[PDB]
Amino acid sequence: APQQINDIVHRTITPLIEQQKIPGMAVAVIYQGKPYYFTWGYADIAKKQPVTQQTLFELGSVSKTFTGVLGGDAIARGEIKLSDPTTKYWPELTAKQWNGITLLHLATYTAGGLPLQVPDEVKSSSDLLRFYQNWQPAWAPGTQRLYANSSIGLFGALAVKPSGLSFEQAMQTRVFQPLKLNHTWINVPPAEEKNYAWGYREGKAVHVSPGALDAEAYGVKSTIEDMARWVQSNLKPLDINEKTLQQGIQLAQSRYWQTGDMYQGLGWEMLDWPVNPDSIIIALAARPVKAITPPTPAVRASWVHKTGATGGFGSYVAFIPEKELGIVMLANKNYPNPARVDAAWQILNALQ
């Protein structure tokens, strides 16, 4: 643990935790490819359980990076193509609006305004079918980006259909296990409950609620050690032995669409490096997108990132491949995104 790293980390995080009233936090910095870990505060306030390197946090939308890489791995296996119509994998989707919507549109939030959330009343597979059949697009496919769990969540479900595996089995077998993410879960097993932090919302201890497409969009829980390993795998996919997984990582960091200074990958979002935090940083923001035709392969000089939240948790991951530099920040309070990005940029800027 070089003193430069200790110093910038603690000097940035301590006041963050103070200002944001975060009960507990874990941070990993990847510096020249090696991880360094830091923890503060409480995984469970009532039971006075500390955050440790083994504490599980809800990743929220950072889960989409796993879905994106799982989908990439499926493409690499020749199981699906991003150019395939959604109806190839769900022929029961017969409503006319689906003509022209591809798996690429689903993965990148460009299907034409699918909603941020699947409604709470949607539980069964028949309920879900009805939901997508009834949805009325605001826009033609591939014209506007609207961040949507109902969009990437559907991508996740369809992407695994040819494999025969459940989404959780595919993710375990094809992503978690190969990468040795042995403390990363869609469903937290009873044996690991001792390590599962409570989230805190308005001072109340909360965990994520079950929902349709939860696993695919927002349901991964993980430790700071596994998340550091996830960042290492994404910083250097070539060091991964499994050919289709290596390829899938690369596909998830390709640039499919541009809006402003940002490029949409599968799960991951990217900006050209160098970049200031103001350019890096609303319940709904509809943005016109330009297609990148054809998509740009993963650019090493990029700030690659994803913010994530559940009711009680706030996470952030960012890395720069050309510099072998990265950070994961996991907290059991959902605090504002700009504060996450500022802190990450401050740390990585100091080390870069």
* Tokens matching residue 296: 């740009």
Other Cβ atoms within 10 Å of 121 Cβ, number: 8
Cα separation of 272 and 67, whole Å?
A: 23
Two tokens at 303?
């700030």
| Residue 316 annotated in ligand binding | no
Consult the annotation and say whether 117 binds a ligand. Answer: yes
276 is in an annotated binding site: no
74 annotated to a ligand binding site: no
Among 61, 150, 302, 315, the one annotated catalytic: 61
Confirm whether residue 187 is marked as ligand binding: no
Q: Which residue has the tokens 């009532």?
A: 46
149-159 helix and 63-76 helix, angle to the nearest 10 degrees: 40
Residue 61: active-site member: yes
**Tokens (6 digits) for 39:** 């923890």
Whether residue 61 is annotated as binding a ligand: the answer is yes
Enumerate the known binding-site residues for a beta-lactam: 61, 117, 147, 149, 309, 334
What residues are annotated to the active site?
A: 61
